Design a protein around this ligand. Sequence first.
Ligand SMILES: CCCCCCCCCCCCCCCCCC(=O)OC[C@H](COP(=O)([O-])OCC[N+](C)(C)C)OC(=O)CCCCCCCCCCCCCCCCC
Ligand SMILES: CCCCCCCCCCCCCCCCCC(=O)OC[C@H](COP(=O)(O)OCCN)OC(=O)CCCCCCCCCCCCCCCCC
Lengths: 98, 140, 52, 63, 459, 345, 120, 54, 64
Amino acid sequence: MPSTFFNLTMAFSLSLLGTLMFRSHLMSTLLCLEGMVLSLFIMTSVTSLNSNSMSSMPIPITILVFAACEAAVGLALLVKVSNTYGTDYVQNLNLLQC
Amino acid sequence: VKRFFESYHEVPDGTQCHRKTYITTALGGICGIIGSAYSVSLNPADSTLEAVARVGRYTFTAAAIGAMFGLTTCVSAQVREKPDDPLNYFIGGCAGGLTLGARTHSYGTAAMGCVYMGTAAALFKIGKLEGWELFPTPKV
Amino acid sequence: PFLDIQKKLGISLDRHFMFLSAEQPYKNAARCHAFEKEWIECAHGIGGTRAK
Amino acid sequence: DGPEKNYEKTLAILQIESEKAELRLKEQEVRRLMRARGDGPWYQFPTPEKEFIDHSPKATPDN
Amino acid sequence: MLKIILPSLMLLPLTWLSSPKKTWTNVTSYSFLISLTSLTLLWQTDENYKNFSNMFSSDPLSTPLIILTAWLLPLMLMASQNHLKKDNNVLQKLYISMLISLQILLIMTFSATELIMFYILFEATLIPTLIIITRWGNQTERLNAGIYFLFYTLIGSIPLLIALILIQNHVGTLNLMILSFTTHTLDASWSNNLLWLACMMAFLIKMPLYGVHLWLPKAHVEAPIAGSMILAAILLKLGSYGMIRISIILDPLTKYMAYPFILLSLWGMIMTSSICLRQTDLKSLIAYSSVSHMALVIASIMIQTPWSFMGATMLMIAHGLTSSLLFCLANSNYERIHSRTMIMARGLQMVFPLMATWWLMASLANLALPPSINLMGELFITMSLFSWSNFTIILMGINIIITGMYSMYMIITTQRGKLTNHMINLQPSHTRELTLMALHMIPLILLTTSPKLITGLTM
Amino acid sequence: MNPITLAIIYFTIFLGPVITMSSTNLMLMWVGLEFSLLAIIPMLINKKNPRSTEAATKYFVTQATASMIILLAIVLNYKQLGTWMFQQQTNGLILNMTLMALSMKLGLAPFHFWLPEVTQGIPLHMGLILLTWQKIAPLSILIQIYPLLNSTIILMLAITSIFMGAWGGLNQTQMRKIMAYSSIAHMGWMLAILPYNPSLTLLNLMIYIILTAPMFMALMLNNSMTINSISLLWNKTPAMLTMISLMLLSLGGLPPLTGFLPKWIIITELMKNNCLIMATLMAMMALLNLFFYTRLIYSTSLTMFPTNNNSKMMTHQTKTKPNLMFSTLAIMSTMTLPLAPQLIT
Amino acid sequence: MMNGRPGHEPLKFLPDEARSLPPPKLNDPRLVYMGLLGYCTGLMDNMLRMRPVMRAGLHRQLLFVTSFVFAGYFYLKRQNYLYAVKDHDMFGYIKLHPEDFPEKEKKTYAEILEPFHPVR
Amino acid sequence: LDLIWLEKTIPKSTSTLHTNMTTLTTNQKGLIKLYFMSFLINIILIIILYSINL
Amino acid sequence: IRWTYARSANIYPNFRPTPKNSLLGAVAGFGPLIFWYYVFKTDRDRKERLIQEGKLDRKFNISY
Ligand SMILES: CCCCCCCCCCCCCCCCCC(=O)OC[C@H](COP(=O)([O-])OCC[N+](C)(C)C)OC(=O)CCCCCCCCCCCCCCCCC
Ligand SMILES: CCCCCCCCCCCCCCCCCC(=O)OC[C@H](COP(=O)(O)OCCN)OC(=O)CCCCCCCCCCCCCCCCC
């Protein structure tokens, strides 16, 4: 369990670093966001199952539901960007600088 | 790097001048790396060649700032035989300011650097003499 | 918490599953239930600094 | 009115200000000591409540 | 002090509820009554200080400043009556309200027993001077002048606030008399040196010290007449009062931290007197004369002789009165000719004989004619400075020589000589402005007759 | 939007920070944070323009990254301590990541690069909603854990927040960007006073909110997006320039306005805790903030900028727009300084 | 800093021990200023809505003054209770820890030697 | 002195310095990619200060 | 009007720093200050020393 939890935290760190280093695809950014979400789900579930915390096993269900609604909101925003610009390229999102 | 930074302070000023210059040069180099990373990330270059050229220019400039500051401060302290005095740090900060003005190629920037960095170095020397806490833990 | 509506009205919206030694379904004790109970029984009423 | 009125008014003002000065110094000392070692009413950082701990007999006897 | 603060406070509803054809009359008459009421602080039949309450008090130094402010307010309304005659009623009442706010907050500032309350009222007085200069100034440089004045003063005043809070934490109450009684000596360390500089530079900016005096000439030039009065006659003396109040808890290291500021003051009054010689603007020339006089006040306060403190006090009051009179005469000429050029109006002795007489007495008070309180201040400052060091008399002599030269150069090029006959728009005189000169000059004569009122704390 | 979804969206916007403040669980404070974020996003994309879409996208990705970092800290604390609250012995790394992500949510520097852009391109009332309401919940989470945080990291974040906010507000012309860097500087002040006295943090937050509300109401009176647009306010609504000047001077912290009280008591407490250099630098950057405020005052009130010809017709028309609680917040944000012992605790 | 004290009723405005405090005089400068602030608020609202400043909305000005005085009175009661309980906890801690707060024997101006710094 | 060098020394020098700093610090290109790279640098820096402070 | 503007407001827009005026400003703003500093410092040190060993006589000097 400590080795696998360390691997899960490094997976979250890699997904976070991928989120922070943008590429041309906002879809890829959202996919990195759900890489973080999935890593959070596995760490929470393994922690609850290891600690036998039956009172807190609803917490993975709540993080899944809340993050899924948040990503639905983000997908709607990406749909709006793709509609206004043809593509989802993040460098098209830059006219609020001035 | 911790024992390095408080190994600057383990020796009185005017003694181990080469070591003090090396530590202040390293501190200037780290500050230049941080500033260059911020510069190339906030304002991206047209290509990676001039990007790393800008990183090297900023790092060398700030390393020269640290080298001139440490050398001037330690030499002044040893040639005027009184280490616990903020004027050595004022002269060292002014020498660093002239170094910055020479790197920028502007005597106005030299005067800015001299006055401001000398004032900052003098206040830092006063703080290290008589116990100024820059980031104090809450007490009251 | 920052605001104490739950403590003012006496309700427990989320205070009953704070830790492992809390209420559990069908009395299934979590791991280190006794140790956490001992820690809470020690730390209660003396504040965070004296608890540490 | 006279000089004695201003004299004794000044005495009362000085007494009030000196009492305020020593009270402010003492409350600085009180806050510093209590934050350093919280043992009185102030700076009582929270702690999980014992009332939400199950004490009933459970399925596992080793608890 | 409340019996002076409250009716000055109630001047504002009188201003905003008076008829537009009665506002100036009512406010001027009632502010004259405010000055008459404020004259009761001179009832000092004992060595004890008039401690009215736990918050307000009167002092042999604070009393002349309060009486001076209460006296200048109706004079301020009189000078502001003319250039607002083509102006809206709401803006007129607003300007009167701004002047009344100056007068109220300055009385509270001088009468405050607490230095933190003194600081709050310090830049609480800074705000309406900014508003007056920026809104009712004439030229396009009024905005820049307001920026310069405000930011010199605030960059000065921030380390004063830090020094005040440090002193409060170290001692406990920051009450003026408690500090004066339980004053503790300083260890002459670097922290105490920087603390001394922090609590000195705010009042040194407000004085202004030489080198940092650049906000004053442009603010005085682009300011209206009431702004020029309030600056040159109250605010510099407010910085003076600040140094006098704060210098008691700064022993012993002021005896060597006084060194650069004394030299700056002496050489700077020489420098500014030379600028007065070679100055082409009348308001600028009077402003630099004010800088030189306040430099004399710096030299006296920093050498910290009791005779020097007295000379600073009498020079405060005398220079405030004579500088207000000089700015009034300059503003009368400016409202005549719509110009500020020093050399453009020359032969005004012919057309305006009584105004040229007022010019002559104002300049004679400026150049320290005996037995006026002006010369008493400069002579006692001279005596204390020579006691401090015998070679100060050379700088004092050069300053006095150039002072006489710029005052007589003022008189010669503004009154004497041939008349510029092309200025056919020269109205003879207003009874209002002649009354303004008379009300400026008579208290100078009365304080010359009795100089014991403005001697100050030391004697 | 029809009133059904208007009521639902406003109720969830209200409910998010309420759950965060009322909740004693890290999980519930988290879920309140995304109630606030998710409920406010349609309100940003309400206008349906490319600038609003840009602001909504940047705001979403910033808050999503910060919320995932917050949940990382919560899960790591849950593993390390077996509970759902940073009690006393959670890891300093976990606490620093929590402070990192809450500072990212707040928009204080060096995480401030999105706040002026998100504030731009959205309507003024949404700028007010963001810059006032969206900060109480991260401040609530920060206040709940004050003795555990790292004073060095907080002091660095705060001083650079005031530096970048002062420099930005000095730089631009746009009213929304000006208010955003003003928010960054004020959050720097609140963050700096956070580890020593959270009561003064709450006092500064309430003072900033009651100063930000009448700014935004006055901007919404004429939709003045620009320094010039608020500069011709004398022809549009001359009965407001006095309060504009007073409230901007209060935002600058000039006495005797009540906006001097938060900076004053914060400096006083910081000097009680002996961080004199930090307090001096904060006060000088506050002077820079006051400089751009004074330039704005010069533009809108003390001078009279030239006007247009259709402003005659706009003065011909009447208006019932300005609401009743504008004057109450204006007076409470200008003339409350003698009630300072009552305002502080 | 005072939230964790014993006997702290959560989210209680004016607890029963606050009833031991004397109430405000109801004509004191704080409440008089609160009424003046309410009157100024009413006048400012009238001028902003472009009504007569004093001759319009008398019911509105009266409601403003009354609400300001009411809220100021109850907030002043709460603040007085808070300052009183702060002083009470102060003096209780001082009494409970006398070894940390010693009454120092302070001498007169006959055994202490302050240095003299001549001004000359 | 007055019209050249004291102006060049205190106020215009302070104004020029702050103008240069505000231009350099808010010459932002407006790209969320650069902003998130900056955020990553901030994260790395704060981890470094935590590691050296302990 | 042109003469007043040239003498007053045109100076700083039309000023450029050269080594000659830099040296002139430095000497005219400092050299008198250090000169009078040394003069007053030497006089005050001599007077203070003369008082400390008492060689200076203040026969009737009471109003200093
Ligand atoms: C208008 C003038 C502007 C320039 C001069 C400004 C004032 C210069 C002198 C004071 C230092 C700076 C202000 C500090 C205020 C508090 C002083 C104090 O309490 O000192 C004792 C304290 C020391 O406190 P202490 O006395 O407790 O010391 C500890 C002693 N033991 C341990 C024995 C108990 O000094 C300081 O803390 C000073 C640190 C200042 C660092 C920050 C300086 C920033 C820059 C300031 C100027 C900025 C504006 C001008 C820029 C250029 C414009 C052209
Ligand atoms: C002998 C004693 C020597 C020691 C004492 C020296 C200090 C004396 C007191 C300081 C006086 C400073 C005066 C500053 C204001 C004057 C400059 C000015 O007015 O600049 C205006 C300019 C903007 O002009 P603008 O209006 O946009 O356009 C022109 C016309 N439209 O403005 C700009 O371009 C930018 C202006 C920025 C704001 C300036 C005021 C605040 C300065 C804060 C300084 C903080 C210092 C510490 C910083 C941290 C440490 C490095």
